[PDB]
């Protein structure tokens, strides 16, 4: 008696559950398109393991609602991205920066489009996207916060940018905050990443007079079985139904004093 399976193998088994190791990448960096995370595009997982050594190496960005985005993206278990063609007439696309490097060249997030002025005219943008697919879509966009009024004017030809992302159930409006703020990766400007769920039969509406980090499409979202886990335990070649941040564990004994965080069929401590 008193058998609670008090030991772990120290590693995580890649079977039967399809394990995906983020390594130097977090879920959000691979979600956005950080150059170092380009190998993660359109890839599926049953469990996604974030590492403590992960870091960002693109443009400094914040995600205000970081927890729910990270959870619900991992719940669907897929990074499958479907490019959509928005009608961005009158603006300049494919904005690049020096802090975000692809293949020895300046670039930006792979799934985001950084819109600037076209011949110093940045018109009032009104794009409507229908989503007639039988499934909830996930759109990811952002708001650029220039450091000075000079950059605001040189980037968008508009002193007071405004952004309104709307659906038939929600409406999101963001105002950029220009300010003298320190550098991050040698960049004083910053971006705030936001998301919007578009249910089937509901049209996506986006109004933006400036500072719009435009989306390039959507992700397939669903409250599935897959999940995410923070763990530094290496991924090994073995088979185990139960997985914890401390490693994989046999599910034979009824309880488990290893870790309150488990994935799969586990003995419920």
């Amino acid at each position, epitope marked *: 008696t008193e058998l609670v399976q008090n030991s772990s193998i120290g590693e995580i088994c890649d079977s039967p559950h399809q394990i995906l190791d983020g390594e130097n990448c977090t879920l959000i960096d691979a979600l956005l398109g950080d150059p170092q995370c380009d190998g993660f595009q359109n890839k599926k997982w049953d469990l996604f393991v974030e590492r403590s050594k992960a870091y960002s190496n693109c443009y400094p960005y914040d995600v205000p609602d*970081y927890a729910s985005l990270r959870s619900l993206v991992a719940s669907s278990g897929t990074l499958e991205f479907n490019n959509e063609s928005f009608n961005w007439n009158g603006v300049t696309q494919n904005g690049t920066s020096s802090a975000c490097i692809r293949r020895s060249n300046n670039s930006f997030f792979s799934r985001l489009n950084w819109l600037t002025h076209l011949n110093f005219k940045y018109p009032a943008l009104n794009v409507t996207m229908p989503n007639n697919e039988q499934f909830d879509k996930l759109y990811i966009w952002g708001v650029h916060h220039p450091v000075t009024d000079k950059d605001q004017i040189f980037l968008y030809a508009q002193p007071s940018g405004r952004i309104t992302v709307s659906t038939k159930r929600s409406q999101q409006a963001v105002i950029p905050n220009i*300010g*003298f703020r320190p*550098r991050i990766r040698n960049i004083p400007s*910053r971006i705030s990443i936001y998301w919007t769920i578009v249910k089937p039969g509901d049209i996506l509406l986006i109004n933006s007079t400036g500072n719009l980090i435009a989306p390039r499409g959507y992700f397939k979202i669903r409250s599935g079985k897959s999940s995410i886990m923070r763990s530094d335990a290496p991924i090994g070649k073995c088979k185990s139904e139960c997985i914890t941040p401390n490693g994989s564990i046999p599910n034979d004994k009824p309880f488990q004093n290893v870790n309150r965080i488990t994935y799969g069929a586990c003995p419920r401590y």
Partner: antibody
Amino acid sequence: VQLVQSGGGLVRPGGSLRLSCAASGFTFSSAWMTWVRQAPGKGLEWVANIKEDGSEKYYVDSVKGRFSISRDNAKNSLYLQISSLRAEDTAVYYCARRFVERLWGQSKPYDAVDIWGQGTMVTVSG
Amino acid sequence: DIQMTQSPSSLSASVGDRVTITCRASQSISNYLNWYQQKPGKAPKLLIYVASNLQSGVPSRFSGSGSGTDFALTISSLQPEDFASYYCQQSYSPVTTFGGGTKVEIKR
């Protein structure tokens, strides 16, 4: 842009003194604001924090109950009421604009000074 | 609540040497570190933001590193104008304190 101070000088120990710090060149009502001191020839020491709305105030332990930070958002000015002066309060009290924000959706946000004032001497002795 | 310890208190290096300053604290802070520079008799200057990120007017020879509780400010080629007292700020909730200074001298 910079800050300007006034209200420093000699005060007998046990006396009171009021420091003022006027602001210009930014949105004052949307940034944390601080007071930082260093004794002559010594290192720097944090003193006080005040929130953008003036709701949450944080002090170093040696000044609790004696100092009180405050601010006016309609104008652009900080205040550091300083009562019950002790001899170890002799220092050049700087005025910083230490703000804070989340850098990658973090639970707790990273902070640093925004800029520094020049600081006024606040000596205390009979 | 949480206190630091800088090392050394004062040092002496030559022009072109690689000098480093250590900055340790109680709890595990990770990225929540900033570095400062007081030009003598002047106000402090933002040097490094979040352990490693350099700032405006910061020469290329400065570099910060570390995580958790062990942090280092490194000058890759010390220069005459680098004479200053260096401080390292902790981004705890209240900014309790930040380390007692490190005073560098060109000494040549």
